[PDB]
Amino acid sequence: HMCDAFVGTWKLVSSENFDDYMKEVGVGFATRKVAGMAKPNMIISVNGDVITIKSESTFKNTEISFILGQEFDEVTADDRKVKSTITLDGGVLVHVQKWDGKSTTIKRKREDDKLVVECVMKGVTSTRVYERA
Numbered sequence: 001h002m003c004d005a006f007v008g009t010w011k012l013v014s015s016e017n018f019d020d021y022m023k024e025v026g027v028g029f030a031t032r033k034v035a036g037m038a039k040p041n042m043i044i045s046v047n048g049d050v051i052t053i054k055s056e057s058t059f060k061n062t063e064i065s066f067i068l069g070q071e072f073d074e075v076t077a078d079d080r081k082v083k084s085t086i087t088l089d090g091g092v093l094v095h096v097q098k099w100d101g102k103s104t105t106i107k108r109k110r111e112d113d114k115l116v117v118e119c120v121m122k123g124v125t126s127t128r129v130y131e132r133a
């Protein structure tokens, strides 16, 4: 009953500061423009200890499966090859990505009927809000 309140199908409904976040991460102009238009659907499921998070959009379809606390390799939508570790901290999924000596953290939390995604790179935060589909 690990992550129950995250499981389901979610649709992006608002974004703030995502272009600046992507700049900070190193995403180039054309990818930022196209990626910034996307309205992904996020599909989260759990089977035993394995959590799966899929993102489907006109830009890219991605999928990660993982066990909490256990590092895995991830190719991000912007084509970074990162080493990721996801843990639960007080009910928040905390996802750290490491690559080329850099780090970014993505937090996912349930707030009311929303799933709120906060992406941080150095001093720059983007907030992405999802509703149930």
Ligand SMILES: O=S(=O)(O)CCCSc1nn(-c2ccccc2)c(=S)s1
Residues within 6 Å of the ligand: 022, 027, 031, 035, 036, 038, 040, 042, 055, 057, 059, 060, 076, 077, 078, 106, 117, 119, 128
């Ligand atoms: O906020 S969420 O889309 O849930 C997590 C965001 C973390 S990083 C990047 N996401 N994308 C991205 C992913 C899907 C669709 C459009 C853009 C980049 S391009 S870089």
